[PDB]
């Protein structure tokens, strides 16, 4: 049995991982759920705790322990470990009967526990996109480290792409290694998107959205986040960087498409010029389990893919002008330095006023923006510790600078 | 280098095998044209002898092979082994100084050099499907006793099949083998067609289609066999059972789907319901050279898939009733034993006659269903050379018999 931790386990992948587990455990033992960290949501955790009934509980916010003990005591038969904070995450981090974690946390935060996860040599199931944008070079360095670590993409189309590669190829490499797409002669990425709510607006109907509109995602039931990030397209202009940095592919060589049914999740052109694609209806359930089995499948009772009732699949380019995000994370990642962080942090203080109807649709990547235009390259640091201060204090900074420039105008 | 003879060289197949291997080697020197065998074409053979000078060419038919000679003559520094019909066949299938065979010479006929192959231990590039389809199980033995050589799909969807899979797995086994699908944990194929040009007619229509009409194919330029084939939607039913034999799938989980533009060639849904396709433009040389370059890929300079441009994909069910062919292949291949030797002789003959303005659509799969209800099962020999015996007995036997038939109707 695969022993596994949940970390955000509460959340949209948290608990779709927590759903394809219970039925991939109908039979045999396959997994076995060993623990579940979140930050607040109490009652919801233990309605899990009572279901799976984990070795180890953990709960950021200290605030709630002693509402977590007292649901916790009901249960019958049952002794978990209950554990705080960063200590309780650390602790879980490097238990032996720990093999693999599901990341599920979401923005920078996500980043702690990723860095934890690889310094125990675990499996990282890894959602949070926010930790590689704006720490891909550090967590390139950790893997260097701890080699028994790796990262597997959770992310629907860093899975797709992971899929469409060849096993014997991608088991002679580990994402975020130099090469990784020489090796698995990997010549472009396409990366698919639904496009988001405000794929068919005018630059006019544009300028009015609302946090409202922007959560209704015709395609994707998620976090508020990354929902906020679909509709302006920051988060495909997260995943360039995050394609850029798992599997080393140059910035020309990575193509946004939008394909509004959201069946093919993206397409890999390897050196003479084939082109293979992964495609399923849009459902986490693949891509969690994927990271979990890989490199092996194992069966389940999903739904099977229909395409002759899907019957339609299209695809257009995707207008820069409409969703600037985008092109400002192309200008990011290429600059490289320290950019991605800054693009990373402005971001989830802009995502945050414009869920908050502080700041309208396209103040967003004017924020961001001069963010950037305001950052000056730093000398990367050579060793791990000081390198990940660094990368704290410049995204500190950048949240601190968006929230100022925000402060300004509004 | 890679040594490579081309079998059939100047059909359909053979040149599009010479014009990829020709625009690769100018990119990096990777093959070697070893050896031109052709049936009658004695012109084409000496033009494309000239451009490659191969160390053997062969001519099939003994009445032309002293004007070949002759011709080969006016070629400059260049003294090649000239070989004639069977003999020389088999002469160079042993030869120590070949890697790789493509076999894309039409029909039943393809049979002997495929078998050759094999005996003689090489990679067998094989677009060739009828030598599947009516040996299958022969072939499959022939691979168990000769465990060095390997048939690598050419035909497109197979080759299609053949990209979205792990080498790690494939490697574990080999196409022809039983269990490939459950090592490489396949649920189900996608084998999509472009539907041929009647795809749009009525019943009424149907009935008076002329092989002028069937010879219009819409996407792929071919030989005049299998794009008959391809108009009748036989074609697909003979890749029903190709994909069967290949790779050890259930007829039950093998879906023909119509996809108009030919962009996904097929899709492979694994255990876990993860379907993963290969797509490209219509081009034969991208199957063709997979075969020549697996378990890698090399560059080429073809031209890259643009997804926008094609904008949008198309999926739908063809119709039994209109393609007959289709449900006929399915009986076929259900019943097992020699029927698919029988389905494939039948429609050899019935073929023909469409082509040459005999018959009419229907009495194509009016022909091959009545010659299959004549058929009873018979014992399978359990050493290669009786069974070869029975199936070459049995293909000819139902060629007699369409004959026949066509003759009493006629
Ligand atoms: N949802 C999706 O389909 C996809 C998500 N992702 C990525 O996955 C990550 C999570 O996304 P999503 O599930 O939508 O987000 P959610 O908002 O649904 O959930 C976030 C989860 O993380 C927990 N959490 C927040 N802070 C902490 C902390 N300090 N310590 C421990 N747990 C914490 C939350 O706990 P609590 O309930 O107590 O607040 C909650 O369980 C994001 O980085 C996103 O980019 C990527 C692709 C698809
Ligand atoms: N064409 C295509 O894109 C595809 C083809 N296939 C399969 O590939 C095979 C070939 O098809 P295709 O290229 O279209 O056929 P063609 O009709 O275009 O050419 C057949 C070739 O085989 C040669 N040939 C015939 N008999 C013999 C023999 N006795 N000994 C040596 N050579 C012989 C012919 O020589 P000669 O010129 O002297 O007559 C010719 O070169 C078929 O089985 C077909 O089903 C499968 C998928 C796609
Ligand atoms: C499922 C997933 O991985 N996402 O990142 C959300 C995709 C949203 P869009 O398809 O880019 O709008
Ligand atoms: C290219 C190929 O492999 N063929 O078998 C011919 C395709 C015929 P259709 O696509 O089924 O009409
Ligand atoms: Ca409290
Ligand atoms: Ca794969
Ligand atoms: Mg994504
Ligand atoms: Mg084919």
């Known amino acids: 049995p695969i022993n596994v931790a949940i970390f955000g386990s509460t959340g949209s992948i948290?608990?779709?991982?927590?759903?394809?587990?219970?039925?991939?455990?109908?039979?045999?033992?396959?997994?076995?759920?060993k623990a579940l960290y979140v930050n607040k949501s109490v009652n919801e955790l233990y309605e899990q705790a009572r279901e799976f009934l984990p070795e180890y509980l953990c709960i950021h916010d200290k605030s709630v322990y002693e509402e977590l003990k007292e649901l916790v005591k009901?249960?019958?038969?049952?002794k978990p470990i209950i554990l705080c904070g960063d200590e309780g995450m650390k602790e879980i981090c490097s238990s032996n009967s720990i093999d693999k974690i599901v990341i599920g946390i979401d923005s920078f935060q996500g980043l702690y526990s990723t860095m934890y996860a690889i310094m125990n040599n675990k499996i990282v199931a890894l959602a949070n996109k926010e930790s590689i944008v704006s720490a891909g070079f550090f967590l390139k360095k950790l893997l260097n480290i701890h080699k028994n670590a790796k990262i597997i993409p959770v992310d629907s189309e860093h899975s797709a792409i992971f899929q469409c590669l060849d096993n014997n190829k991608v088991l002679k490499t580990k994402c975020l290694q130099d090469n990784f797409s020489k090796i698995n002669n990997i010549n472009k990425i396409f990366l698919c998107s639904s496009?988001?709510?405000?794929?068919?607006?005018?630059?006019d109907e544009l300028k009015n959205v609302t946090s409202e509109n922007a959560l209704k995602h015709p395609k994707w039931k998620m976090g508020k986040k990354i929902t906020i990030d679909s509709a302006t397209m920051m988060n495909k202009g997260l995943e360039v960087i995050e394609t850029h940095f798992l599997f080393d592919v140059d910035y020309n060589?990575?193509?946004?498409?939008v394909h509004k049914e959201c069946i093919i999740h993206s397409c890999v052109e390897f050196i003479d010029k084939s082109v293979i694609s992964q495609m399923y209806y849009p459902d986490m359930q693949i891509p969690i389990l994927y990271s979990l089995?890989?490199?092996?499948?194992?069966?389940?009772?999903?739904?099977?893919?229909?395409?002759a009732q899907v019957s339609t699949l299209t695809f257009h380019?995707?207008?820069?002008?409409?969703?600037?995000?985008?092109?400002?994370?192309?200008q990011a990642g290429i600059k490289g330095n320290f950019y991605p962080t800054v693009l990373n942090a402005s971001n989830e203080i802009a995502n945050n006023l414009f869920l908050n109807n502080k700041i309208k649709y396209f103040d967003i990547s004017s924020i961001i923006s001069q963010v950037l235009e305001s950052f000056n390259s730093?000398?990367?640091?050579?060793?791990?510790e000081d390198?990940?201060?660094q990368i704290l204090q410049i995204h500190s900074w950048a949240k601190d600078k968006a929230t100022d420039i925000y402060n300004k105008h509004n």
């Not at 060589?253 to 498409?257: C, F, G, L, N, R």
């Not at 730093?378 to 791990?384: L, R």
Request: include cysteine.
């Open 14 to 33: 948290g608990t779709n991982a927590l759903n394809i587990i219970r039925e991939c455990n109908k039979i045999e033992n396959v997994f076995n759920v």
């Open 74 to 78: 009901n249960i019958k038969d049952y």
């Open 195 to 203: 496009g988001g709510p405000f794929q068919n607006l005018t630059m």
């Open 253 to 257: 060589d990575i193509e946004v498409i």
């Open 293 to 307: 089995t890989w490199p092996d499948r194992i069966k389940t009772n999903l739904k099977p893919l229909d395409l």
């Open 317 to 330: 380019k995707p207008s820069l002008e409409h969703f600037p995000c985008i092109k400002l994370a192309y």
């Open 378 to 384: 730093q000398k990367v640091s050579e060793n791990s």
């Open 387 to 389: 390198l990940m201060k």
